[PDB]
Amino acid sequence: PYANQPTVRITELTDENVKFIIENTDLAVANSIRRVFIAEVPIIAIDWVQIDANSSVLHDEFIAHRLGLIPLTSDDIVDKLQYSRDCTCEEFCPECSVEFTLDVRCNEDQTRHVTSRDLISNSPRVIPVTSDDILIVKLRKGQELRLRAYAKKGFGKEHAKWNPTAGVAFEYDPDNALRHTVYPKPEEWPKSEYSELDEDESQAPYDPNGKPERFYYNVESCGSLRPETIVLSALSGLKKKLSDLQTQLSHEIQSDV
Amino acid sequence: MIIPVRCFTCGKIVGNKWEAYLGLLQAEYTEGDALDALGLKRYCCRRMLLAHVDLIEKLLNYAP
Amino acid sequence: SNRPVMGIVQDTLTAVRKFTKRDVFLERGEVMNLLMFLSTWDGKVPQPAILKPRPLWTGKQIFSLIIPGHINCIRTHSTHPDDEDSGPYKHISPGDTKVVVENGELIMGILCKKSLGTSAGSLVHISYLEMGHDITRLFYSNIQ
Amino acid sequence: AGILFEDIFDVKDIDPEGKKFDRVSRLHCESESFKMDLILDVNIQIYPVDLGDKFRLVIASTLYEDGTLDDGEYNPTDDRPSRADQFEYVMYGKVYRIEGDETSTEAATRLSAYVSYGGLLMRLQGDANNLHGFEVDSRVYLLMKKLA
Amino acid sequence: MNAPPAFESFLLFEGEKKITINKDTKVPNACLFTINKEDHTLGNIIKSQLLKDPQVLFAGYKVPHPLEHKIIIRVQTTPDYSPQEAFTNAITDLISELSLLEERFRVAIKDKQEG
Amino acid sequence: KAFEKKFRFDYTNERALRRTLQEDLVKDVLSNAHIQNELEREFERMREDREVLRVIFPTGDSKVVLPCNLLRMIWNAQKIFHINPRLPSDLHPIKVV
Numbered sequence: 001p002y003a004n005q006p007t008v009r010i011t012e013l014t015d016e017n018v019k020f021i022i023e024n025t026d027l028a029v030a031n032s033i034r035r036v037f038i039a040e041v042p043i044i045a046i047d048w049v050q051i052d053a054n055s056s057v058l059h060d061e062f063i064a065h066r067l068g069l070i071p072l073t074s075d076d077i078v079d080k081l082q083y084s085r086d087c088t089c090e091e092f093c094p095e096c097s098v099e100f101t102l103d104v105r106c107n108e109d110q111t112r113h114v115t116s117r118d119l120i121s122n123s124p125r126v127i128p129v130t131s132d133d134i135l136i137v138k139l140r141k142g143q144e145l146r147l148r149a150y151a152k153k154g155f156g157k158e159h160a161k162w163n164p165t166a167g168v169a170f171e172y173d174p175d176n177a178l179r180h181t182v183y184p185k186p187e188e189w190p191k192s193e194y195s196e197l198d199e200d201e202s203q204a205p206y207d208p209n210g211k212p213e214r215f216y217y218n219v220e221s222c223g224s225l226r227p228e229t230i231v232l233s234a235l236s237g238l239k240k241k242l243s244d245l246q247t248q249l250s251h252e253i254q255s256d257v
Numbered sequence: 258m259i260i261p262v263r264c265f266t267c268g269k270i271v272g273n274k275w276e277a278y279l280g281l282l283q284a285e286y287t288e289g290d291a292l293d294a295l296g297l298k299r300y301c302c303r304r305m306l307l308a309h310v311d312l313i314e315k316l317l318n319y320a321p
Numbered sequence: 322s323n324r325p326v327m328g329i330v331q332d333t334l335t336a337v338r339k340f341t342k343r344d345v346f347l348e349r350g351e352v353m354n355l356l357m358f359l360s361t362w363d364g365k366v367p368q369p370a371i372l373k374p375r376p377l378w379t380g381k382q383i384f385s386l387i388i389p390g391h392i393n394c395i396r397t398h399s400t401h402p403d404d405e406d407s408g409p410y411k412h413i414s415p416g417d418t419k420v421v422v423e424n425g426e427l428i429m430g431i432l433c434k435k436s437l438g439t440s441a442g443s444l445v446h447i448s449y450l451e452m453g454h455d456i457t458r459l460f461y462s463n464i465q
Numbered sequence: 466a467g468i469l470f471e472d473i474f475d476v477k478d479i480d481p482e483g484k485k486f487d488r489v490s491r492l493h494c495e496s497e498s499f500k501m502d503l504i505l506d507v508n509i510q511i512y513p514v515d516l517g518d519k520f521r522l523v524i525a526s527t528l529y530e531d532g533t534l535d536d537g538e539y540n541p542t543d544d545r546p547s548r549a550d551q552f553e554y555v556m557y558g559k560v561y562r563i564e565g566d567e568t569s570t571e572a573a574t575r576l577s578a579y580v581s582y583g584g585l586l587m588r589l590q591g592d593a594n595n596l597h598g599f600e601v602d603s604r605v606y607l608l609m610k611k612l613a
Numbered sequence: 614m615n616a617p618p619a620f621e622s623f624l625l626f627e628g629e630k631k632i633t634i635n636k637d638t639k640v641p642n643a644c645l646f647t648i649n650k651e652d653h654t655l656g657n658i659i660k661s662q663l664l665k666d667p668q669v670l671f672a673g674y675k676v677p678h679p680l681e682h683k684i685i686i687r688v689q690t691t692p693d694y695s696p697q698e699a700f701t702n703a704i705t706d707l708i709s710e711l712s713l714l715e716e717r718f719r720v721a722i723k724d725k726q727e728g
Numbered sequence: 729k730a731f732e733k734k735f736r737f738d739y740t741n742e743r744a745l746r747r748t749l750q751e752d753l754v755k756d757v758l759s760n761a762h763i764q765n766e767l768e769r770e771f772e773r774m775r776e777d778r779e780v781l782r783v784i785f786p787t788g789d790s791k792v793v794l795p796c797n798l799l800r801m802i803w804n805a806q807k808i809f810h811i812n813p814r815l816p817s818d819l820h821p822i823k824v825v
């Protein structure tokens with residue numbers, strides 16, 4: 001029984017970012033947490049595009065690539081949805097995917113902007129985050145885009161479109177008391193926003209017994225999940241990976257004996 | 258050809274900011290001010306819009 | 322040219338010079354990570370060079386585990402002053418510019434191209450002449 | 466006891482040539498009892514040393530102060546009483562050279578013992594009788610305790 | 614032409630063991646844990662949690678090849694402690710820390726949202 | 729002068745022999761002239777080799793390329809057998825010759 005006893009302080013919480021501090025953790029746990037924010041927090045994104053008509057100046061898989069990157073609301077439906085690989089249905093079904101439609105024709109002289117607002121989902125829980133709107137393609141008069149897409153569950157470790165973060169700022173030891181980074185000329189380096197030093201001194205005095213214990217986070221959200229949901233989803237997902245691992249380890253230990 | 262949906266570096270959505278960015282420049286904003294107004298703080302995202310070339314406008318001139 | 326044709330190169334050569342500096346100290350966790358990448362490791366963690374106030378292993382200590390067998394080599398660092406060999410500190414180098422590998426252990430000296438590159442008398446050359454190609458093969462990969 | 470050498474040294478110079486390395490300083494110390502000259506590389510970051518500092522230096526072949534050989538492997542879990550508990554700065558090294566004023570016929574009156582503590586070098590000069598416990602290729606422990 | 618599927622880094626193909634334990638013959642009380650479809654995420658926390666155990670003599674992990682998706686964790690314990698027992702305790706300590714972290718983050722959100 | 733001092737075995741100096749050789753070995757070296765004759769022949773052969781070298785390398789460049797590294801082999805032997813340079817040796821000079 002040598003578990004840490006982390007404490008959490010949330011400094012800033014908006015609709016886009018959550019700023020918080022974790023204290024009394026190992027650097028490995030703090031790094032694995034940010035590393036799960038990016039790669040192992042599931043969301044719903046378009047991963048299956050079928051284009052019926054595309055007269056735009058962008059080729060078919062150019063459009064599909066853009067549709068995959070469009071963030072979709074995933075706050076609570078993502079937990080309910082199953083992985084299409086795990087689901088027992090056919091290619092797709094409502095329990096493992098969300099169907100999308102896009103049918104735009106340009107007939108006016110003015111350029112028609114095909115945006116995420118033109119994506120229509122079969123489930124109100126999963127919609128483009130913008131509903132300015134993300135531009136998919138611009139249509140000239142006489143050009144049309146007619147496609148149907150399926151959005152499925154996934155996480156950033158597979159493709160960056162399932163990464164829910166727009167930048168995870170991670171920091172520790174802002175005053176470099178541990179000297180994990182050695183400045184050739186410390187006076188030349190800007191103070192961290194979390195620096196507690198005075199203007200006169202550039203580095204905190206070296207701490208021989210110090211260890212990384214306090215970690216600063218700024219988890220910005222793409223929009224698919226609330227920033228606080230990304231953190232909670234990461235903490236439960238990381239716990240799930242460990243609990244799943246221990247179940248396998250228990251079998252291996254039992255199997256050997 | 259068209260504004261990328263996400264910033265290449267961090268994945269922030271930038272494909273809904275090109276028209277707003279152009280409008281701000283129309284409003285006599287400097288490029289730095291317009292990027293700040295759009296919330297693009299990291300220079301990776303500012304790179305996306307500051308260096309974008311909208312060739313799709315030229316392509317729409319050609320009849321389908 | 323009766324010398325090795327391949328040696329240590331861009332990153333490993335630049336880093337091994339930094340690694341074998343006198344003032345490189347590794348914590349318990351850092352050392353255990355490095356030994357994971359030592360295929361020839363016997364599994365015994367060496368006694369740290371510094372035991373108190375904190376256990377710290379030097380870079381030379383960890384590199385000594387990489388060195389195969391019990392080869393003995395004498396080289397000089399690229400920045401070795403010419404008059405140091407004639408001075409009162411010939412065998413205790415102020416700059417750590419004298420490379421002595423004795424009984425397979427790097428007891429002093431900063432390793433560089435002169436002691437790890439493709440030159441006759443190189444520590445890599447001794448490994449081949451003493452331990453053979455198979456052990457020298459592992460020596461190359463373990464350094465990297 | 467398993468102690469090869471013990472004395473009290475006073476730091477005379479910290480880096481006469483200059484600061485060759487950031488985290489390591491070369492102490493030039495002299496003893497007052499045995500009049501042994503000491504050159505020592507110290508991890509100055511974790512164990513700062515100042516000019517004129519007085520410290521007790523012990524060179525021992527074992528830390529257990531019971532005659533039991535350590536065998537030269539890291540054993541943090543060992544609970545056996547250790548001589549290191551009384552000292553602040555403990556280093557483990559290997560003596561790699563023993564020089565002396567010996568001639569073809571006459572023996573050595575002054576002996577120099579060189580020890581490498583994982584690359585940190587120590588030279589211990591003085592009368593030969595004071596360094597008789599030093600044998601090349603032998604593992605020794607350096608134990609330092611600053612005296613107020 | 615030779616691009617592996619993206620899912621291959623976290624999905625086990627049929628007949629693949631998630632974790633295998635191999636005794637280390639070099640030294641006593643040492644085992645090698647080969648975990649499939651894992652990366653530095655779990656390798657680092659398990660390694661760092663093991664290093665907190667006073668009965669663990671050696672704890673270390675490695676990704677043998679970035680293009681492969683294996684982590685090898687080497688654990689050496691004291692004679693009275695088993696590497697497998699250290700591994701299980703390390704995960705429980707990690708799970709307890711994560712579960713406690715989840716609870717304290719939820720409280721922080723509620724306090725921040727409330728005012 | 730340097731060549732003779734460094735390579736000619738000195739079986740006349742009793743004190744020097746005690747430092748380098750063991751007691752049972754110095755007596756044999758000092759007692760019988762058959763061993764001393766062998767040592768004298770050894771230096772004469774070395775002196776002949778010295779003149780041959782001068783012809784082969786008139787420039788005096790002693791750096792050569794040869795199969796076996798004798799100096800490192802000796803260094804290996806010292807470490808393998810834990811030779812103590814301070815103590816007198818038990819290797820009879822004649823066994824070397």
Ligand SMILES: [Zn+2]
Nearest residue numbers: 087089093096
């Ligand atoms: Zn389904």
Ligand SMILES: [Zn+2]
Nearest residue numbers: 264267301302
């Ligand atoms: Zn960005």
